[model samples]
Target: SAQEEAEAEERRLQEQEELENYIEHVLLRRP
Candidate 1:
């Protein structure tokens, strides 16, 4: 159960990081 939970969290963090990067990229292109 712990291993499964850890994997889910890792995946969530990766998705979050990618989303932040995408937002930053868009903001940079706006100017």
Candidate 2:
């Protein structure tokens, strides 16, 4: 493979984590 897709995978995971954290914060804060 000339191009590695790891970057895309990492970014996807990062966004997933960010979304999860945001949801948790909203639920906990109630805002």
Candidate 3:
């Protein structure tokens, strides 16, 4: 269904956001 696809896309974006946050944290801790 279109609604389910939309929810899946939202979840994927959320996962991407979390991954970006984790990478940012690692880079900030680096010299």
Candidate 4:
């Protein structure tokens, strides 16, 4: 259904953002 697709899309975006932030944090911590 459209509602399920929308929720999945939102979850995907949230996970992508989390991954991007995690990479940024790791890079910032690099020596």
Q: Please, what are the lDDT tens digits per residue for candidate 4 over residues 2-26?
A: 8889898799889999999999899
For each candidate, give its TM-score against the true structure: 0.53, 0.58, 0.50, 0.54
Give one digit per residue, the lDDT tens place, for model 3 in 1-31: 6889989879888999899989989889883
In model 3, the Cα lDDT at residue 15 comes to 94
lDDT for residue 8 in candidate 3, whole number 0-100: 83
Which pairs of residues collide in candidate 4? none
Against the reference, the lDDT scores of all candidates come to: 0.89, 0.86, 0.88, 0.90
Best first by lDDT, ranked: 4, 1, 3, 2
Tell me the deviation in Å of residue 30 in model 3: 2.3
Whole-model alpha-carbon lDDT for candidate 2? 0.86
How should the candidates be ordered by TM-score, best one leading?
2, 4, 1, 3
Summarize candidate 1's per-residue lDDT along 1-31 as a digit string, tens digits. 6889989879888999899989889989985
After superposing candidate 1 on the true structure, give the runs of residues whose Cα lies further than 4 Å from its correct spot.
1-5
- Clash-forming residue pairs, model 2: none
Candidate that scores best on TM-score: 2
Q: Which segments of model 3 are wrong by more than 4 Å?
A: 1-6
Candidate 2 per-residue lDDT, tens place, 1-31, comes to 5257777678888999999999999999996
